[PDB]
Design an enzyme around this catalytic site. Structure first.
Site, short mmCIF file in Angstrom:
data_model
loop_
_atom_site.label_atom_id
_atom_site.label_comp_id
_atom_site.label_asym_id
_atom_site.label_seq_id
_atom_site.Cartn_x
_atom_site.Cartn_y
_atom_site.Cartn_z
CG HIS A 140 3.40 34.14 51.30
ND1 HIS A 140 4.59 34.14 51.99
CD2 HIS A 140 3.67 33.66 50.06
CE1 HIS A 140 5.54 33.65 51.21
NE2 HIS A 140 5.01 33.36 50.03
CD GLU A 141 1.54 33.51 46.75
OE1 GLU A 141 1.85 34.14 45.71
OE2 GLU A 141 2.26 32.60 47.20
CG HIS A 201 5.13 37.03 46.35
ND1 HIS A 201 6.46 37.13 46.69
CD2 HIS A 201 4.74 35.80 46.73
CE1 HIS A 201 6.87 36.01 47.23
NE2 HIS A 201 5.84 35.18 47.27
#
Ligand SMILES: CC(=O)N[C@H]1[C@@H](OC[C@H](N)C(=O)O)O[C@H](CO)[C@H](O)[C@@H]1O[C@@H]1O[C@H](CO)[C@H](O)[C@H](O)[C@H]1O
Ligand SMILES: [Zn+2]
EC number: 3.4.24.-
Length: 884
Positions: A655-656, A659
């Site tokens: 998820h990170e 980014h």
């Protein structure tokens, strides 16, 4: 030896290794600061007497500030607290510096300053602001107009004579001249040193800034010669500060003595009179993290501590050893005090239960001097590290390391550590054009939870300042905490190397994956280092990812998720987490070709899919693994912070990572997809993981069912586009409709698979869009636009990330239509996604058969075998899986 004798020695050498009596140091500091105040106040009072202190330099002027506070001080501070002229006692000489040419305004704007200036010149020439200068006293004027200068002085009631020689550059002239006047037109070898040497041999110097609100390097160098410094960009332009006619003798005398000094804070240290009644009920809490910005008094306290930190960190940033620079006794004493406090610190502390220790330690944490030949280790490292870190052996011999900078700007791990209280020396070579610094550690400030109850259990500032390095110049460091060494860079050339030579450092376990090559050797070395268990911290470099990790957190993850199988953990970190993401984004990864289906699509498309120019791996993404994070138990950024450990199959991890790999041209409605367009990375991993391994991770993230409900209902509105828009993308909340929005992104996965008639190919659609988008982003526009389905565009499209922009929507419509070879507007409208006219017209120009509106429905996220295709062109079928 006595504590007294140790302190006397350390004031010269910097070695605080035996210094434990912080109250003793505090008393010495108390008197040092008091004699600075006495000197300053007596001087100012003799200058001002009861004359008018009216001084107005205009907007066309600079501020001129003390730098060395022990031997320089302000002369004119304006009502807004800007220092508009300073005095210097540097090297026992006498100097005075104004931020504008006051000498040309003494019969005009600043006529009222003349009497005060007279005393000032009387002081410069005689050492006594009350002693008349002799008639025809010889004045050398250099770098500013002579006649106007001499006339100004004459306007003040003085009778100077032209010395007729250059006292800046002629030594014979300096010895007979009674005053030197400098402005920014001057020329000389070693300007700062020259100025210093004249000052120190007794030539009084009067400096006027001659470039109004502009900065001058010549001036900065003259000022630095006097132990002064030029103010920030803009000068007095905006504030237009001045000292009014009403300013009193007592007031200015008082401000001058107090400027940049905190005798009240020193007294508090001495007496131990720490505040026992702070109102903690005003602290607030956000996702587990307590802060206290609104506790009355707290910010003023903390901002006074920031002054001292800024003061000493200016020396750290410029790689200056404080104990080698003369006239730094106050700051030496702050530093040695702080090192002595570190001898006694104990954890954990609480803001309520331990007021004295908490607040003194608070101050001490902010004062650390890294540039030195000797110093002391903090005794207790609490939640940061322990006995292993304290005892790491260090290399007595010099070690040579070569590092690759993958982008122009950032930091990368050197692969070595500073040991607590032990000198290392470092230099870099073969740097080409890169600007370089060294720093220690990667913790972010919120990582010390000192406001959380009983959680001040580590230092506030584990990350050092960036210490600037010179090509081929050694710097000697001592850290009280020990730390992981980082090379900080800017202005570099992607792919260049740098060479690092370091002596006296320790070797943390370090997994250094070599691009393309067999890293079998490196893996077993790492395991051996890990098994040797000499470190509290380790690091990993693999691809564009760097992990800075608390050792036991990593062990904990290897044990829980991998049953102690280190080898599988490492492989899966490299393959299932790292390579998975970067391969999905279509980057050029060394010695690793594209899959056949992608290669062949790029071939038929006639695209550049492999060049480094367009598709090189991006800048490093850093990951912290530690007991705390900057925010919550996990926090976005670079580094991003994790507190659970490190799981290669983890949702958070990817998820990170996502980014970092987001791009605005693949965001639906800009920020509305801020927490959506990154989810293709965790989603891909889980889909892969179920197939290869069998674990079924986060299988309910993608809410096909409720996305459908919203689509069906928004669709019956008069404006079906807007109807769906209202229900899906309108809500501006940071995580609003997260699962429902994700379902849009997977539609194209299921579509592509049907189109290629191969379930294994589905995700390739996103890899093709990333490759397309980098071409759109940076290819020569005129040359490449036809190949990218943008022939009708005179110019490159925009890259706005704004919710009200169609820059993301447009490129999505164009890219998907171009790759699929079908006009996809019906399905875009079905999802409430609007597009610009230009983009609409461009799709028309492709001349593709329309793809009628469709919807892929599923009752699971990770298992596509059960997905069902709905035809949405004629009306809205029933949800095709039974409830409940
Ligand atoms: C939107 C999303 O995928 N969120 C997950 C993500 O969040 C990262 C930060 N902590 C943040 O921005 O909030 O990664 C975390 C940790 O790895 C979770 O999976 C997030 O999912 C959320 O998890 C929490 C539980 O911690 C709640 O159940 C939320 O409902 C869930 O969405
Ligand atoms: Zn997020």
């Amino acid at each position: 030896a006595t504590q007294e004798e140790i302190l006397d020695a350390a004031l010269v050498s910097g070695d605080s290794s035996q210094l434990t009596d912080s109250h003793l140091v505090a008393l010495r500091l108390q008197q040092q600061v008091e004699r600075i105040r006495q000197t300053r106040t007596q001087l100012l009072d003799g200058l001002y007497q009861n004359l008018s202190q009216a001084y107005d330099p205009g907007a066309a002027s600079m501020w001129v500030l003390p730098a060395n506070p022990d031997n320089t001080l302000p002369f004119l501070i304006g009502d807004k607290g800007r220092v508009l002229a300073s005095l210097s006692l540097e090297a026992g000489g006498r100097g005075l510096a104004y931020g504008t040419n006051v000498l040309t305004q003494l019969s005009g704007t600043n006529a009222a300053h003349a009497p005060l200036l007279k005393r000032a010149v009387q002081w410069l020439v005689n050492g006594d602001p009350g002693a008349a200068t002799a008639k025809d006293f010889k004045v050398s004027v250099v770098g500013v107009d002579k006649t106007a200068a001499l006339n100004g002085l004459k306007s003040a009631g003085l009778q100077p004579a032209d010395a007729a020689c250059n006292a800046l550059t002629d030594a014979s002239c300096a010895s007979t001249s009674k005053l030197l006047v400098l402005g920014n037109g001057a020329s000389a070898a070693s300007l700062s040193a020259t100025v210093r040497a004249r000052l120190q041999a007794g030539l009084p110097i009067l400096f006027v800034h001659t470039n109004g609100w502009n900065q001058s390097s010549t001036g900065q160098q003259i000022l630095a010669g006097l132990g002064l410094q030029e103010g920030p960009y803009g000068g007095n332009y905006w504030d237009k500060d001045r000292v009014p006619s009403s300013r009193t003798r007592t007031r200015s005398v008082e401000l001058g003595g107090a400027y940049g000094q905190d005798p009240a804070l020193v007294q508090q240290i001495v007496d131990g009179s720490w505040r026992t009644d702070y109102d903690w009920s005003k602290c607030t809490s956000y996702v587990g993290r307590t802060t206290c910005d609104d506790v009355p008094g707290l910010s003023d306290f903390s901002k006074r501590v920031d002054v001292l930190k800024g003061a000493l960190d200016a020396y750290n940033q410029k790689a200056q050893n404080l104990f080698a620079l003369p006239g730094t006794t106050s700051l030496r004493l702050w530093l040695l005090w702080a090192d002595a406090v570190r001898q006694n610190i104990r954890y954990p502390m609480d803001k309520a239960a331990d007021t004295a220790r908490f607040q003194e330690t608070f101050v001490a944490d902010a004062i650390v001097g890294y540039v030195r030949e000797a110093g002391a280790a903090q005794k207790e490292l609490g939640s940061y590290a322990g006995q292993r870190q304290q005892s790491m052996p260090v290399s007595g011999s010099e070690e040579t390391l070569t590092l690759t900078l993958p982008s122009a700007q950032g930091f990368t791990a050197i692969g070595r550590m500073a040991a607590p209280g032990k000198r290392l020396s470092i230099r870099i070579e073969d740097a080409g054009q890169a600007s370089l610094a060294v720093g220690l550690n990667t913790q972010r400030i919120g990582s010390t939870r000192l406001w959380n109850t009983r959680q001040y259990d580590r230092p506030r500032f584990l990350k050092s300042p960036d210490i600037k390095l010179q090509a081929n110049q050694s710097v000697a460091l001592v850290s009280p905490y020990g730390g992981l060494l980082q090379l900080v860079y800017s202005g570099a050339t992607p792919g260049q190397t740098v060479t690092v030579k370091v002596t006296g450092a320790a070797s943390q376990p370090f997994l250094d994956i070599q691009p393309g090559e067999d890293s079998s050797q490196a893996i077993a070395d790492f395991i051996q280092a890990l098994d040797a268990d000499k470190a509290d911290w380790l690091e990993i470099r693999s691809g564009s990812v760097e992990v800075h990790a608390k050792v036991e957190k990593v062990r904990g993850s290897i044990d829980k998720d991998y049953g102690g199988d280190v080898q599988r953990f490492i492989r899966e970190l490299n393959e299932v987490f790292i390579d998975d993401a970067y391969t999905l984004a279509g980057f050029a990864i060394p010695n690793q070709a594209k899959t056949p289906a992608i290669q062949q699509e790029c071939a038929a498309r006639g695209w550049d899919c492999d060049s480094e120019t367009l598709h090189k791996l991006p800048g490093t993404q850093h990951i912290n693994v530690d007991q705390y994070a900057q925010c919550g138990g996990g926090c976005s950024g670079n580094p991003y912070d994790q507190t659970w450990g490190l799981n290669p199959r983890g949702w958070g991890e990817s998820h990170e990572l996502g980014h970092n790999l987001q791009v605005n041209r693949l965001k639906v409605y800009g920020g509305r997809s801020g927490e959506i367009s990154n989810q293709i990375f965790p989603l891909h991993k889980d889909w892969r993981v179920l197939r290869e391994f069998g674990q079924n991770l986060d299988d309910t993230r993608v809410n096909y069912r409720n996305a459908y409900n919203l689509i069906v209902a928004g669709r019956a509105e008069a404006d079906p586009l807007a109807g769906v828009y209202k229900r899906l993308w309108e809500d501006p909340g940071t995580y609003a409709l997260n699962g429902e929005r994700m379902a849009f992104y997977t539609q194209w996965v299921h579509y592509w698979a049907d189109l290629k008639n191969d379930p294994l190919q589905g995700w390739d659609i996103w890899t093709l869009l990333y490759l397309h988008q980098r071409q759109v982003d940076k290819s020569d526009w005129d040359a490449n636009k036809a190949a990218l389905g943008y022939g009708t565009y005179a110019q490159r499209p925009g890259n706005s990330g704004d919710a009200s922009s169609t820059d993301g929507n447009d490129n999505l419509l164009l890219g998907l239509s171009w790759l699929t070879q079908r006009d996809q507007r019906p399905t875009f409208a079905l999802w409430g996604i609007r597009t610009s006219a230009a983009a609409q017209a461009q799709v028309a120009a492709y001349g593709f058969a329309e793809q009628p509106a469709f919807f892929y429905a599923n009752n699971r996220t990770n298992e596509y075998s059960t997905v069902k295709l709905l035809d949405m062109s004629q009306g809205s079928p029933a949800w095709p899986f039974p409830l409940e």
